[PDB]
Design a protein around this ligand. Structure first.
Ligand SMILES: [Mg+2]
Ligand SMILES: [Mg+2]
Ligand SMILES: [Mg+2]
Ligand SMILES: [Mg+2]
Ligand SMILES: [Mg+2]
Ligand SMILES: [Mg+2]
Ligand SMILES: [Mg+2]
Ligand SMILES: [Mg+2]
Ligand SMILES: [Mg+2]
Ligand SMILES: [Mg+2]
Ligand SMILES: [Mg+2]
Ligand SMILES: [Mg+2]
Ligand SMILES: [Mg+2]
Ligand SMILES: [Mg+2]
Ligand SMILES: [Mg+2]
Ligand SMILES: [Zn+2]
Lengths: 96, 97, 150, 127, 226, 25, 200, 91
RNA sequence: GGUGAAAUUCUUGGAUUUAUUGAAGACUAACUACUGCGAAAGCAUUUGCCAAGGACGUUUUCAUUAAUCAAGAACGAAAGUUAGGGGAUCGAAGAUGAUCAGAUACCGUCGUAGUCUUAACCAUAAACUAUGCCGACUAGGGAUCGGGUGGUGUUUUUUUAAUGACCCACUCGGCACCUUACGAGAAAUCAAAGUCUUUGGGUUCUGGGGGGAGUAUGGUCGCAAGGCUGAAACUUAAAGGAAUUG
């Protein structure tokens, strides 16, 4: 499941939360996957997909807003875009 | 006292059975308390098919069969020469006639 | 039994009569306590530690291989958790079922089952307070329950 | 050779209907009811009035051009009785003996997946 | 029963059986018979144009009649009028259905009934509703009388037989799909894909209904009528 | 008689008493 | 004056370098920054402007012309909408139902914004106060307050006069009555309390 | 403490206008002044400006709405009805 | 059309019926049974997500954390209340047609509140197994549900493996049923309603002739309907649990 794979990742592998952190990771080549919240502004979505397309990086569309995505990564605040830096223990990169 | 052990129905461990309506008078009888009598019949008859036999293309076509499931109630069943009444000793018999 | 249900299922382990075991064992407890603590260093509870040794290795019980018990083995090495393993599991189930109701007002089944779970939490906290394993004036509340699990 | 039809016998309690149609049913032929061959207002579902309807239907069927017919016996259906009335079947005798040809008979009573609710009340029709 | 209408004309005769023209019904190519029968409309007067008064008619006929052999006994078929020419109105596939007697004979107590339907679209924009039905049966030498499925294999059967239905409806548009249903070849791949679960008696699938239509669809029925 | 409509007679009775009682109050 | 919000919908001029702006009645769901599509092939989404003959049966439409080109007609008030009942393709017509419950046939090319007017349920709140009705009609019109006609003098009203406050004659008035005689219940077919359904 | 038992927001009316008429108002005043959830920015910042006008203080978004609640039930069933009719036109 | 028979009623301006398409709201047939789950009330079209749960298996873990419970609470069918939405079916009031000596009833035709839902109250039911809960022992038999165990058993795959589905024996838990009474009971009956003048496993609640009367009164909860709590004065040998014969 998508939720447990994030939960396995959330505690084993390092990552960045939010927009500005995601962009620098996408810029510097550190990212290997990003997750996009459902209700994110579509102009913000297009700029992330452009860097991902311009750095050969995968993109995932979570079926939920910034509310659930923050809870899905085990935080009490809202997360719009998250860029994983390494899986660590899970198999999110090899799947989907 | 209790006239019988199950005493109306097959409800043992449910409480509720989501009842149905009688076919004759529409009484909201419980489904497990109902008196289900499956009706199976030929589409026409077993005696008048002779007259219909010569008037058919597709010789001996199917003589299809008519099915039905009738839900009667206690009042309706007893009134119309159905399971109406038995002796106290013979009410234990759970086998069909 | 089944205090919070009507079930009467007697389904449990059956400890062997021979308090010494297994009569075909490999090297003795000097290595078992070393393996138990290293599984404890990665966060596995005694239930998980015992199961892993029981099946992956051959250990009928750490209680007959070693005169001590796994929790007391962990306690002696300083790896005892802040709350007993059983109580930590009632708490997390309460946190999971509490969050569910915050999304589903009308789920009265969850309302009934959350009440039963917290009563087991209360009857264990009360018991753990008398034993003095848990400090007194220790109370379970919903506000800090989520932070207590993790 | 044979020019078929759709007999569409709908004869429940309190009435009796027979009327053939075209292949698509949008065109009807020779409609007559059990109430037009007797004066009772009560024997509308009588077995005799069922044949008398199917006798007049078959009389007009042969002068339009249809020589065979398919049969569709229908009960009231829905939340109602679902069983063919007393005359829903005697009509078959009249058309079969009249001289028309029969093929692909079936029962077409409307049967729901537990549609809404019957009338008469919960206590039922009490008498 | 005749003198019971108090008024016959609230506002206050010719026999019409001399003013109809009988047409002919053609079935599409993938049925060994195309002579269905004859229908009626009034004279196509200058203000009526009876061509469109029979354009939308649908006729119900048994699939044994189209196929000749009676083993396609139940298998009801409805046919839709598409285009009309010279007393010879054409008619194409409008659906398939089961007769009441067999669909009810298919169902008996002391066995679990399994339904599965899909709403996949084919290549020719024909959006169909493809149903299904099956029943676990009493195996040979079976001692117990129930043979009820374990109500979790039931959903597994519903998953498998719906995957197959979606897969082949895509790519088989209207005549191959109609010639697919004729031999019940779909059922034969249902039974071997599910025989690892239960025997699944009586897999004669179910009726099928067209939901929506493409444009008036007139450029290639050469193979649909010859 | 039957207990439903002796219980029902008493409720119409109790309704009557509170009505006349409150006039004094 | 009205209780339904209005939208400022901006379009590009198709014939000049110009930015012609439109004043629509906002559909509940329309938001600032949305995109609005207006045409015959425009999608079936709330906020779009589509003709009655080119929308499927059972569609919820508001701000519906009843002659093609009126730029707006029935279903204008808050929480009101129209539904299509059945098209007549030849001699093109559409059968629809009005907020009053009336069935009206209008030209198939009449238009309407899909959805329902914003502000529904505005009348479920009691004003509770005379002065609340003062501000409701400070900006509508001066039809408030209302002296009763029976609390008047006979010179001033048909119902005025008399030693007791009463009508005197029937308050149900005919169609053929003239200006001056038409005070009361105009053209009433029945009166009393509404027992039964609409029976339309 | 608890300043009132049941009047709530309608304490401003004192003893006027009748008890039942005061609690019809209390229900709609509770909704029309409540803070609602932003469906664009994901925050709890939607406020009523005027009847049918609900502006989210964050992200500065205004959505047309009902008089006293952001989304009336009759409107929501409309939005689903259009959807199912839409997803079949291009089915 | 309706019915025992009719009539109110709709109908040549087309009723019913046939055909074609569409909309609305509710229900979820047949499968569906002495079968499943749930504390009970209750719960059946399909799929997804969320959390939960009994049983089972266990050479895992803790270690008496347990049983039952004043006060205090969660849930609690249907009807009912307040505010909306909905209002397709059926439909307490009512209008008619009957029936009748009467009929404001049963039956026929319509028909509003409700039936549906969201939000909040209501706390009742022959809410019945008219059997409180926990624990123990005491007779036989088959069937079934979930899990499991064993068996060269049968079938399908790749004749052939694993699986899955069946068969046989056994077992743990469960919804039930069949026979008999050594046992109980007042009998009806009961494997629990047994292990009670050979009278004691633990624990909660309720009753003391029938009525007056679930009334009066005082509190208390409720918007209300009413719920909870709850007497007395006075009256008087008079209805059944159960069986028997007529
Ligand atoms: Mg019950
Ligand atoms: Mg036990
Ligand atoms: Mg007609
Ligand atoms: Mg089952
Ligand atoms: Mg079903
Ligand atoms: Mg207890
Ligand atoms: Mg009681
Ligand atoms: Mg009781
Ligand atoms: Mg016991
Ligand atoms: Mg068993
Ligand atoms: Mg069970
Ligand atoms: Mg006493
Ligand atoms: Mg007494
Ligand atoms: Mg005496
Ligand atoms: Mg007696
Ligand atoms: Zn916002």
């Amino acid at each position: 499941s998508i939720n447990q794979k994030l939960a396995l990742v959330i505690k084993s592998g390092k990552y960045t939360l939010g927009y500005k952190s995601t962009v620098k990771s996408l810029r510097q080549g550190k990212s290997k996957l990003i997750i996009i919240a459902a209700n994110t502004p579509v102009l913000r979505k297009s700029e992330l997909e452009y860097y991902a397309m311009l750095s050969k990086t995968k993109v995932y569309y979570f079926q939920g807003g910034n509310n659930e995505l923050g809870t899905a990564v085990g935080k009490l605040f809202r997360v719009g875009v998250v860029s994983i830096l390494e899986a660590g223990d899970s198999d999110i990169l090899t799947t989907l | 006292p209790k006239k019988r052990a199950s005493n109306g129905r097959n409800k043992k461990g449910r409480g509720h059975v989501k009842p149905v309506r009688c076919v004759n008078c529409s009484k909201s009888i419980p489904k497990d308390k109902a008196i289900k009598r499956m009706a199976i019949r030929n589409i026409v008859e077993a005696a008048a098919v002779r007259d219909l036999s010569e008037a058919s293309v597709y010789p001996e076509y199917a003589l299809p069969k008519t099915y039905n499931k009738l839900h009667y109630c206690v009042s309706c069943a007893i009134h119309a020469r159905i399971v109406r009444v038995r002796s106290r000793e013979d009410r234990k018999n759970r086998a069909p006639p | 039994g089944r205090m919070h249900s009507a079930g009467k299922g007697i389904s449990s382990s059956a400890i062997p009569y021979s308090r010494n075991a297994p009569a075909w064992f490999k090297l003795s407890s000097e290595s078992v306590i070393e393996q138990i603590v290293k599984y404890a260093r990665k966060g596995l509870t005694p239930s998980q530690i015992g199961v892993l040794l029981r099946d992956a290795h051959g250990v009928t019980q750490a209680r007959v291989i070693t005169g001590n018990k796994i929790m007391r083995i962990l306690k002696s090495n300083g790896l005892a958790p802040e709350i007993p393993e059983d109580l930590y599991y009632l708490i997390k189930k309460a946190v999971s079922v509490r969050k569910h109701l915050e999304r589903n007002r009308k789920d009265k089944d969850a309302k009934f089952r959350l009440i039963l779970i917290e009563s087991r939490i209360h009857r264990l906290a009360r018991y753990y307070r008398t034993v003095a394993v848990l400090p007194p004036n220790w109370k379970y509340e919903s506000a800090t329950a989520s932070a207590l699990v993790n | 050779s044979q020019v078929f039809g759709v007999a569409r016998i709908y004869a429940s309690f309190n009435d009796t209907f027979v009327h053939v149609t075209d292949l698509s049913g949008k065109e009807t032929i020779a409609r007559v009811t059990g109430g037009m061959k007797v004066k009772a207002d009560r024997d509308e579902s009588s077995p005799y009035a069922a044949m008398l309807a199917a006798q007049d239907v078959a009389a007009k069927c042969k002068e339009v051009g249809i020589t065979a017919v398919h049969v569709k016996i229908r009960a009231t259906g829905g939340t109602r009785t679902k069983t063919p009335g007393p005359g829903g079947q005697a009509a078959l005798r009249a058309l079969a003996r009249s001289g028309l040809r029969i093929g692909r008979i079936e029962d077409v009573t409307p049967v729901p997946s537990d549609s809404t609710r019957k009338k008469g009340g919960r206590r039922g029709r009490r008498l | 029963a005749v003198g019971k209408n108090k008024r016959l004309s609230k506002g206050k005769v010719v026999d019409p059986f001399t003013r109809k023209e009988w047409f002919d019904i053609k079935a599409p190519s993938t049925f060994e018979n195309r002579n269905v029968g004859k229908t009626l409309v009034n004279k196509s007067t200058g203000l009526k144009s009876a061509s469109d008064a029979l354009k939308g008619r649908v006729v119900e006929v048994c699939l044994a009649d189209l196929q000749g052999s009676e083993d396609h006994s139940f298998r009801k078929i409805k046919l839709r009028v598409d285009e009309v020419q010279g007393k010879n109105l054409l008619t194409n596939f409008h659906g398939m259905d089961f007769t009441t007697d067999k669909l009810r004979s298919m169902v008996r107590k002391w066995q679990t009934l399994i339904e599965a339907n899909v709403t996949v679209k084919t290549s020719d924009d024909y959006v169909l509703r493809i149903f299904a039905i099956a029943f676990t049966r009493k195996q040979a030498n079976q001692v117990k009388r129930h043979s009820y499925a374990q109500s979790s294999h039931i959903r597994a059967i519903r998953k498998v037989i719906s995957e197959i239905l979606t897969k082949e409806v895509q790519g088989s548009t209207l005549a191959q799909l109609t010639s697919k249903l004729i031999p019940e070849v779909i059922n034969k791949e249902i039974e071997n894909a599910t025989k690892d679960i239960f025997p699944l008696q009586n897999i004669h699938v179910r009726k099928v209904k067209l939901l929506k239509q493409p444009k008036f669809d007139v450029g290639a029925l050469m193979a649909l009528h010859g | 008689m039957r207990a439903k409509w002796r219980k029902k007679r008493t409720r119409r009775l109790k309704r009557k008493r509170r009505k006349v009682r409150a006039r004094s109050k | 004056g009205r209780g339904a919000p209005l939208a400022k919908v901006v379009f590009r001029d198709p014939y000049k370098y110009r930015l012609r702006e439109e004043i629509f009645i906002a559909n509940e769901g329309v938001h600032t920054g949305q995109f609005i599509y207006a045409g015959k092939k425009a999608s079936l989404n709330v906020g779009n402007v589509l003709p009655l003959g080119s929308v499927p049966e059972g569609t919820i439409v508001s701000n519906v012309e009843e002659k093609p080109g009126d730029r707006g007609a029935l279903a204008r008030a808050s929480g009101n909408y129209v539904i299509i009942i059945g098209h007549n393709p030849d001699e093109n017509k559409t059968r629809v139902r009005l907020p009053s419950g009336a069935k009206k046939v209008i030209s198939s090319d009449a238009r309407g914004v899909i959805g329902v007017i914003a502000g529904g349920g505005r009348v479920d709140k009691p004003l509770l106060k005379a002065g609340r009705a003062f501000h409701k009609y400070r900006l509508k019109r001066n039809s408030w307050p209302k002296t009763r006609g029976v609390a008047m003098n006979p010179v001033d009203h048909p119902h005025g006069g008399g030693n007791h406050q009463h009508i005197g004659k029937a308050s149900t008035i005919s169609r053929g009555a003239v200006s001056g005689q038409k005070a009361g219940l105009i053209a009433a077919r029945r009166t009393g309390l509404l027992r039964g359904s609409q029976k339309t | 403490a608890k300043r009132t038992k049941k009047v709530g927001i309608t304490g401003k009316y004192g003893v006027r206008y009748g008890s039942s008429l005061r609690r019809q108002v209390k229900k709609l005043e509770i909704q029309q002044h409540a803070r609602y959830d932003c469906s664009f920015c994901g925050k709890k910042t939607v406020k009523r400006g005027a009847a049918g006008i609900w502006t989210c203080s964050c992200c500065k978004k205004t959505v047309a709405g009902g008089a006293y609640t952001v989304s009336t039930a009759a409107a929501a069933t409309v939005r689903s009805t259009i959807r199912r009719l839409r997803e079949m036109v291009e089915a």
